[PDB]
Structure formats: structure tokens, C-alpha cells
Design a protein around this ligand. Structure first.
Ligand SMILES: CC(=O)N[C@H]1/C(=N/OC(=O)Nc2ccccc2)O[C@H](CO)[C@@H](O)[C@@H]1O
Ligand SMILES: [Br-]
Ligand SMILES: [Br-]
Ligand SMILES: [Br-]
Length: 410
């Protein structure tokens, strides 16, 4: 599309701060790097196996009773340490996420939070047991460590209330809320979660829960987002899903993980955030470890087109996306986070797609903040400010720099 259409697309960096602790300063630096490279958003997983975000008030009402704030905080901390007791820290505070959002906003960077369920919720499962909610776990080939039992009302009522509170905090602070839903019970079904749901006639109950979280998002003025996995599994539609969800599409799946195609979901009216698995990097991952190692991720930022949805060949298949997301995962969270690796990956994606990414506007904001005299000198500042172009992409840094230089002189 046009110059305007390209720059209006979302350019997103995702950070798995669910499995692994990131300090507020580490995340601010990511925001900084995103702002310079011309991204529009930071996607931040806060619940993803671990749950590394606590609000000031964590009081929950569900199941006819209340769970007091201190007990919820204690339970969640215990759940999170039980998944991984990160030496670097456990959870971000309300004050810290509030500051990250404000800080990002000052650099025209949005934040997109993710709180995962009913899969990738190890911490919430143990937390619920510490609060007296027995057997919240899905149980298939074994008792799952990651996933909630969809028939357990007590657990479901609790989790929904908890996600409601988080959504309450983000309401009016962010546009988007990602409720996840990927890889249901992968640990207990050898990554055949959806097949197991259908087998047990529980997929309809998955949709009921997915639709609930979508509705919850919308009634709090948040645009819902979820991963594509659970939606219209195997291109079948006898179970219906909320059409308003923004789909974070990462893959059509693997042998016998028979996900809906992007073609099929588009046909149902869905819009996509292009979250191609091609751009995945797992901290510390090398060729010998499996998929999603650094060298290949870096290669793919050039090799896979910006608009190419996974399992499709662009432009032969050309489906509406709202933008694209590159993803940093923490599967082994004891692995050392090396900022420079993430920065190289981010830079490569921006460099290969200069039409989509903004120019770096940081020097401009620094020169503007220096403003507080004759009519001649004030006239000089008048025109130099008028000459500023806020619409420049990454191809036009030199051009922006000249405009800033002229402002400095004035
Ligand atoms: C939505 C998503 O990307 N989920 C997981 C994810 N899924 O990627 C897969 O390839 N998952 C998968 C593998 C085999 C069978 C089914 C799904 O990738 C990341 C890096 O490994 C994990 O951190 C994520 O939790
Ligand atoms: Br079913
Ligand atoms: Br590598
Ligand atoms: Br680990």
C-alpha cells in the first residue's frame, strides 16, 4: 500500500517476561531501541508459565467468596517461584508497569500486555492450590503442569476474575490485551491439545472460555488478541468463535497439530497480527538445541516478507494484516538475556523493512526540549519548527537529521 498505509501498520517486538524476569530498566532499554529503530509497540508477556506482574490490590472475588490481596500475592509468588525461581527477581510491581507504559508513550511506543490462559499458566495453577482450589489442572496422559481443567468451575471462576483485574488495570492504558490460548495442555498430550479437547468433547467449552475473555476485553474497552492455535481447529466450524479477536498468527502447525489456515480464518472475517514463527528467537538457543536459534532468526528477517503469514507464499497469498511482530522467547529462562542479541535481531528486521519502520525521532525530541529575544531569531525558530516532518520512514534518516540540524541552528 501507500507510504501512509505502511507506516500505520504495527511493528512489534515481543518479550517473554512471563517465563523470565526482566527489570524495568531492561524493558525501558528495549523501548528505547524500538523507538530508535521505528517500531510502534512492545508486546509484553507478563503471564506465560510464570506470572511476573502483581497489582497493588490483588483482592479476588469468585465462587461466592473473597481471596484477600496478601494471600493472592503470596500464592502467585509461590506459583511463579515453583515454575522458575529466577535469581534476578520475581514480579514487576504496579508502579513499574505504570512507569514503563508512560515512558513508552513519551516515545510514541504502545505497550501490549499478554496474560496467558488456559495454557501456559503454571504459576496460576499452583497459586490456586495455595488458595485452596484443588485440582485446577487439566488431566489427560498425565496431570498437566501448564493447563487448567475446563470443567473445573472453581478454577475457571477464579482465573476469569483474576484476568478481569489485570484487564481493569490496563483499561485506558493500552489499546490491546493478549489473552493467549496457545498450545493447550501440550505437556500432557504430547502437543496434541486440540485433538484431545475434541476427543473428550471439550472444544466447545474451550470456545466458551475464549469467547468470554474476548467479551471481557471489549467491555473494558480493550481490543482482544489471542494466538491462532485454538481458533477453528482443522478448518471446522461446528464450534463458533468471537469474530472481533485480533489473531496473533504464528504457525499453521506441525505434524498432527492441525491448525486453521490463515486463508480459512480470513474467510471467517479475522484480522491478523503477523507473528511469524520465522522470526522467533529463544534466549541462548543454538542450532543443536532445535528451532528458533539466533542465526536463522536473523536470516529470516530478510528472507520472509514483512506481510507473509506463516504457511503462505507472499504475494501469491495476500491477506490483510494490521502489522507484524518479532518474538523473543524464554523457554529456558535460566539462559542469560543478552541485550545485544535482541538488538541485532530487532535492527535486522527494521533494516530489511525500511518502508514500514519510522525514522529515529529521538534527537528531534531532545532538540525540542531545549526550547524555553529578537523578532528575527524567533522567526528563525518559527520556520525551523514548521519545517519538521513527523512522517519519515527509516529510508530517510539523513533527511530528518538535516531538519533537526536546522532546528538546532535556530
Ligand atoms: C504462540 C507460541 O509461539 N507459543 C510457544 C512456541 N511455539 O512454537 C512451536 O513451534 N510450538 C510447537 C512445537 C511443536 C508442536 C506444536 C507447537 O514457540 C516459543 C519458542 O519455542 C514458545 O516460547 C512459545 O511459548
Ligand atoms: Br467439542
Ligand atoms: Br545461532
Ligand atoms: Br531453565
Amino acid at each position: 500500500g501507500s507510504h501512509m498505509e505502511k507506516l500505520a501498520k504495527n511493528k512489534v517486538i515481543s518479550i517473554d517476561a512471563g517465563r523470565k524476569y526482566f527489570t524495568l530498566n531492561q524493558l525501558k532499554r528495549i523501548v528505547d531501541k524500538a523507538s530508535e529503530l521505528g517500531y510502534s509497540d512492545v508486546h509484553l508477556l507478563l503471564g506465560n508459565d510464570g506470572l511476573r506482574f502483581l497489582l497493588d490490590d490483588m483482592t479476588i472475588t469468585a465462587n461466592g467468596k473473597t481471596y484477600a490481596s496478601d494471600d493472592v500475592k503470596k500464592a502467585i509468588i509461590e506459583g511463579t517461584k515453583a515454575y522458575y525461581d529466577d535469581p534476578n527477581g520475581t514480579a514487576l510491581t504496579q508502579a513499574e508497569v505504570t512507569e514503563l507504559i508512560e515512558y513508552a508513550k513519551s516515545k510514541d511506543i504502545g505497550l501490549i500486555p499478554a496474560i496467558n490462559s488456559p495454557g501456559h499458566m503454571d504459576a496460576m495453577l499452583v497459586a490456586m492450590e495455595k488458595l485452596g482450589i484443588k485440582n485446577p489442572q487439566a488431566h489427560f496422559d498425565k496431570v498437566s503442569k501448564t493447563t487448567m481443567d475446563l470443567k473445573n468451575e472453581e478454577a475457571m471462576n477464579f482465573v476469569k476474575a483474576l484476568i478481569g483485574k489485570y484487564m481493569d488495570f490496563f483499561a485506558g492504558k493500552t489499546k490491546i490485551f493478549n489473552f493467549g490460548t496457545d498450545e493447550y495442555a501440550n505437556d500432557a498430550t504430547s502437543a496434541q491439545g486440540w485433538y484431545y479437547l475434541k476427543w473428550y468433547q471439550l472444544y466447545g467449552k474451550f470456545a466458551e472460555y475464549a469467547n468470554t475473555l474476548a467479551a471481557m476485553a471489549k467491555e473494558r474497552g480493550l481490543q482482544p488478541m489471542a494466538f491462532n492455535d485454538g481458533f477453528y481447529y482443522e478448518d471446522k466450524d461446528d464450534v463458533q468463535f468471537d469474530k472481533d479477536v485480533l489473531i496473533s498468527y504464528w504457525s499453521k502447525g506441525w505434524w498432527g497439530y492441525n491448525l486453521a489456515s490463515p486463508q480459512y480464518l480470513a474467510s471467517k472475517g479475522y484480522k491478523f497480527l503477523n507473528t511469524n514463527g520465522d522470526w522467533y528467537y529463544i534466549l541462548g538457543q543454538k542450532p543443536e538445541d532445535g528451532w528458533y536459534f539466533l542465526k536463522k532468526a536473523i536470516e529470516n528477517t530478510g528472507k520472509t516478507p514483512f506481510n507473509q503469514l506463516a504457511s503462505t507464499k507472499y504475494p501469491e497469498v495476500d491477506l490483510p494484516t494490521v502489522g507484524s511482530m518479532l518474538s523473543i522467547w524464554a523457554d529456558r529462562p535460566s539462559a542469560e538475556y543478552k541485550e545485544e542479541e535482541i538488538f541485532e535481531l530487532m535492527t535486522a528486521f527494521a533494516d530489511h523493512n525500511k518502508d514500514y519502520f519510522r525514522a529515529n525521532y529521538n534527537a528531534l525530541r531532545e532538540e525540542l526540549a531545549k526550547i524555553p529575544y529578537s523578532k528575527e531569531s524567533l522567526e528563525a525558530l518559527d520556520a525551523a519548527k514548521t519545517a519538521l516532518n513527523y512522517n519519515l520512514n527509516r529510508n530517510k534518516q539523513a533527511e530528518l537529521d538535516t531538519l533537526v540540524a536546522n532546528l538546532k541552528a535556530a
